[PDB]
Write a structure and sequence with these properties.
Largest sheet of chain A: 6 strands, mixed
Entry title: Structure of capping protein bound to the barbed end of a cytoplasmic actin filament
Organism of A, C, D: Bos taurus
Shape of chain B: flat
Oligomer: part of a larger assembly
Chains A, C, D: Actin, cytoplasmic 1
PDB class: structural protein
Bound molecules: adenosine-5'-diphosphate, magnesium ion
Number of strands of chain B: 0
Keywords: Cytoskeleton, cell-shape remodelling, barbed end, structural protein
Strand content of chain A: 15-25%
Distance between the termini of chain B: 4 Å
Chain lengths: 371, 7, 371, 371, 7, 7
């Protein structure tokens, strides 16, 4: 029987059967409820909505994500997301197929346990595993010595791995991520008098993000240029037809990744959390890992981010070192891709937690290989 | 927030 | 005139005049800077803050310790610390009193040289010395035969000094220390749900570390005790007054002192560096060294540490031998107590390097009687 | 069939078939294990790497030397070195060829016993001999009367050998060796703030020693120059790309062979142990030794060590002697070369203990031929 | 990391 | 430490 690979990421839940090169489902990891009372009763309007149904009814809904910073904050609305993930998006019975779930590093032990409880006892999965999302991005690139910088909506993490052994004492998780980068775009859009406050409006600003922010190679030069002339400014039509315009804000939004001080956090930028991670491992295991900075997750999609990472971390690293930023196509979806690859291995059939194990061991089984 | 304490 | 004794600890500076039995001033050794723009022009605020002033303003400053692993990583923030040590905390003019500093074993030679230049050419001291931290302690213990395990926020040293004649070749310096365990306490507290990130949160973690944490007499058995029961659960209120319930964590946090493999350092535990330091010495003195094992510095204050130490070296050492972990109350400042004694011990009055000598032999004078 | 020759050196294993003019296999005598949990199971890791493998994978492994000062301290580690020597490095079935083992002088009876047992019973060698390393050293220069000063990673020893017969009562051992000089090199590099602690870092220091240290001819004038101009000091770059400056330290490290007091060893320097072995020799023969002081083993590779040995032992000898230091190239692997020479010969073809002999007579054959 | 090279 | 009673 084929396995199911599901990444419960903070923005979207990528799901599908193993061995395939892309996920069959890519729906926003959102649940929604009505904000107003109903009248046209012949509709039979639903007790709740999910995914692109939530994008379809979007303007009349309170929206929430049950996953934040990688913690599942609401197990009821997360169970809704899984119910839809299987029984509507893939039409599979999960009780007949093993499942590989993906999880963030340095996340509370209870989340692995509460996930596993729901999977074995609600959804009756025959077997399960809870893979570290970083390890999967390395499998996804085929390499087996490198440092994975993974960042989507909820978490940024850097995990170095060498000859396939972990370096767990060198993992850094910076909670500056895509959701936060969206919050910050809302604040700075307010500077030009464009206002966005409802959860539906928040996701319009997510859309602006996707298609309008680049990560300038030098912030002083570009900010000087954008203060000097209007040539760089681009416009975007709302669903209500009027054209917003983005100027300095285009590159300020992801500049935060290299200056988290704009968002009030003390932490050093994603270049610095990469450099500080390579410096946490042995001198040997280093020049190698400076030739292998591997990027993943949707906030690694900004134009020029690989250039900026290089021209930043090369200024931190020693001279006469080769620094290269392996930023693949489909870095958007590497982990599904990595999970698909891991589910293809014969030996991984020995790694699973089976329901027969869970029923005899109790919750502590979920922790054998984790960060 | 989300965190059990600290955010 | 009365001389001054100052211990430049990586975490907290202890200073005072000679002769006294406790160091009058304890500014936790921290410099800190405004994390945001100052807005109230009427407040009369200042550029940067130190010690308990830094602790008072903590929630709005980025905090930097200018000593790491005993190395003075920043000289301007150290010199700021000394300016506050003398003219604010002690209200004494260091250009009118001899001064004795303290320094770690095996610290880079350049450190002593810079310190000396700052004392003689910033603070214009009449005469100066720099005692090797461990050494001072045995004076503080009275006993002139013994091996000193000094363990503070930064370094850890295990000097054996015999019949009052040292054994420098047998010295071992292990860079596992209190800062390292504060940093590890952040990682393990994450597992139950609690996020700590800022420099200011590092001090809250330090408070949790100084109150609820203790050393297991046997890790596996106490581990098992958790796994069986809530009996080791205790709770601490953050500045929010919210209580955080930590456990299995207390007897893990400092278990690192005996298992540095938990934190990705390579070198053996403080018990093994104790035994191995004794084993560097000529085979006669070992009987006397086992009977004169001395603990000092704030990280030796964990409850249970003596019991664990005594049993651990009793495993490593011979049978038909007696092991005495001499660990007094007030072990903490058992340096600015030893330096008090040393400056009081009037036979030492030739040892203070005169400014005139330093003004002729230059920085080379500092290498007089050190390792 | 061609016998197999193995030089069981404390730092490096030199091995080949009899009649090769130089060893085929030349590799660091390291057994490694991983410092961290393995996570990419599809890599197919192996539990203990050996030789150049361990040196390739350096920073993810703990590195064990199984031989300390000629004593085999860990037998299953050493058995793995021999397994790799035979099946992989030389690619031969050791049960089908006779075997020649080198051994250090004044090394305990049990080491030869366990070597014997492992050869005759793990590897089932058909015939075997264990040679006093210095015999082979002298033979390697084609001469048959002299005194050898051998100095490997683990042992320094002096052996007078006249008309090819050794003088057993006149042998000396000094354990101050290449590892010990690596140790002292750590400590002195620490003065300039270059810390090195992990075994991996140890190997870096070994590499540094092997390319920037040299024996000063004239210590006092040299060290006065080093305190007067920077021209004697130069640099090397880590596997971490960053440059390191080696200075006073260059000569201070190798000076220890003449001044063991520098490592707190009361034992006499190499010039004193050579002299003190010549003076243990019968008064007639001392002249014949002075024309025939042969150096062997890798720590005799320091530039100027011959010049220093000459100019030093000059002072220990009476005037009117031909004090000539035999220090050729190939002194590096000389011991092995001598093995290959001696192994090729029908007279030595009488010496090899037959497996059957040992099988019938137990250890009682080796208990003789070890003298 | 405090030292020069090395940590 | 190698030695049985010495190193
Ligand atoms: N082309 C793009 N440019 C900038 N950001 C993007 C782009 N595509 C996606 N993102 C950001 O990535 C975030 C989610 O990343 P991803 O890792 O794919 O999802 P998840 O974090 O849920 O696994 C989204 O919030 C989105 O804003
Ligand atoms: N009761 C305690 N138990 C364990 N550790 C403690 C305790 N109190 C303080 N410490 C640790 O000791 C450290 C300070 O060490 P100390 O010896 O006082 O100064 P230094 O670090 O300069 O040697 C603090 O960082 C703190 O974490
Ligand atoms: N160029 C060099 N200068 C100084 N020492 C060297 C040099 N090359 C090798 N060595 C030393 O030689 C030692 C090992 O030599 P060798 O005798 O071949 O191995 P073993 O001592 O194990 O038999 C090492 O400790 C190394 O430090
Ligand atoms: Mg993700
Ligand atoms: Mg201290
Ligand atoms: Mg040798």
């Amino acid at each position: 029987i084929a396995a199911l690979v599901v990444d419960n990421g903070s923005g979207m839940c990528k799901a599908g059967f193993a061995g395939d090169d892309a996920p069959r489902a890519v729906f926003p990891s959102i649940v929604g409820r009505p904000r107003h009372q109903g009248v046209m009763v012949g509709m039979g309007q639903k007790d709740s909505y999910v995914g692109d149904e939530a994008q379809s009814k979007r303007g009349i809904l309170t929206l929430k994500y049950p996953i934040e910073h990688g913690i599942v904050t609401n197990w009821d609305d997360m169970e809704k997301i899984w119910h839809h993930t299987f029984y509507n998006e893939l039409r599979v019975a999960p009780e007949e197929h093993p499942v590989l779930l993906t999880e963030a590093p340095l996340n509370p032990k209870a989340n692995r346990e509460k996930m596993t409880q729901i999977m074995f006892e609600t959804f009756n999965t025959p077997a399960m595993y809870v893979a570290i999302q970083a390890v999967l991005s390395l499998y996804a690139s085929g390499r087996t010595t490198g440092i994975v910088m993974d960042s989507g909506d909820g978490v940024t993490h850097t995990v170095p791995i060498y000859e396939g052994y972990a370096l767990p004492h060198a993992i850094l998780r910076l909670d500056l991520a895509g959701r936060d980068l969206t919050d910050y775009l809302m604040k700075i859009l307010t500077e030009r008098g464009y206002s966005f406050t409802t959860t539906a409006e928040r996701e319009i600003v997510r859309d602006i993000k996707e298609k309008l922010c680049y990560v300038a190679l030098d912030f002083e030069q570009e900010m000087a240029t954008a203060a000097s002339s209007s040539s760089l400014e681009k416009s975007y039509e709302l669903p209500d037809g009027q054209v917003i315009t983005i100027g300095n804000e285009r590159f300020r939004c992801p500049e935060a990744l290299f200056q988290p001080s704009f968002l009030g956090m003390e932490s050093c930028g994603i270049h610095e959390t990469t450099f500080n991670s390579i410096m946490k491992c042995d001198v040997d295991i280093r020049k190698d890992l400076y030739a292998n900075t591997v990027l993943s997750g949707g906030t690694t999609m900004y134009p020029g981010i690989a250039d900026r990472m290089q021209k930043e971390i090369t200024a931190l690293a020693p001279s006469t070192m080769k620094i290269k930023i392996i930023a693949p196509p489909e870095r958007k979806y590497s982990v599904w891709i990595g999970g698909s690859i891991l589910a293809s291995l014969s030996t991984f059939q020995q790694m699973w937690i089976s329901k027969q194990e869970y029923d005899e061991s109790g919750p502590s089984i979920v922790h054998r290989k984790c960060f | 927030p989300a965190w059990x304490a600290x955010c």
